[PDB]
Design a protein around this ligand. Structure first.
Ligand code: QYJ
Length: 167
């Protein structure tokens, strides 16, 4: 049993809710919150901008030190950093950004990072300002992630359509 409340069971291991990932993280304090990161860990907008703002920019400060030491991530890759006031850890995962012309096939590799964690609070990878189809992202999630994932969806109208179109 875990403390994720009001989620909708989609499969054995994937659950979904119309909710602000910032609020879910603050309420649940999950072991892992997933950030929709880019390879430079520049948390300017979308989920990343919102999570970083909620940490009062501490996420960005930590991220800048990480990049200065290690260099950029790979598209499809990830790193584990602090969850600050949101979670124990933040798993920064880089889905392909279609608005930058990146290969959508890398979306499955991006979701494979979730399998290294037994339970996660997460956004749909490559959705929103990343420019991929959220219905496609949900399908790849369900077909790739085997650990227990709680997906928070900011947009109410998108949530309604993700539920009604899910196979
Ligand atoms: O600012 C915040 N939260 C905050 C939460 C999510 C987002 C965000 O970018 N959502 C995206 C969106 C929007 C529309 C369609 C989409 O496919 C997507 C994908 C993605 C998502 O839903 O995962 C931005 C901000 N909270 C402060 C306290 C009030």
């Amino acid at each position: 049993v875990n403390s994720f409340s009001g989620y909708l069971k989609l499969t054995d291991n994937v659950y979904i809710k119309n909710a602000d990932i910032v609020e879910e993280a603050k309420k649940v304090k999950p072991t892992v919150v997933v950030n929709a990161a880019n390879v430079y860990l520049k948390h300017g907008g979308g989920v990343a901008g919102a999570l970083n703002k909620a940490t009062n920019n501490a996420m960005q400060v930590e991220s800048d030190d990480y990049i200065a030491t290690n260099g950029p991530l790979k598209v499809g890759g990830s790193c584990v950093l602090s969850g600050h006031n949101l979670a124990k850890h933040c798993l920064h995962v880089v889905g392909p950004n279609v608005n930058k012309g990146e290969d959508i096939q890398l979306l499955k590799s991006a979701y494979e990072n979730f399998n290294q964690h037994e339970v996660l609070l997460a956004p749909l990878l490559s959705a929103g300002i990343f420019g991929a189809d959220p219905i496609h992202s949900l399908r790849v999630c369900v077909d790739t992630v085997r650990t227990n994932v709680y997906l928070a969806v900011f947009d109410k109208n998108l949530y309604d359509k993700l539920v009604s179109s899910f196979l």
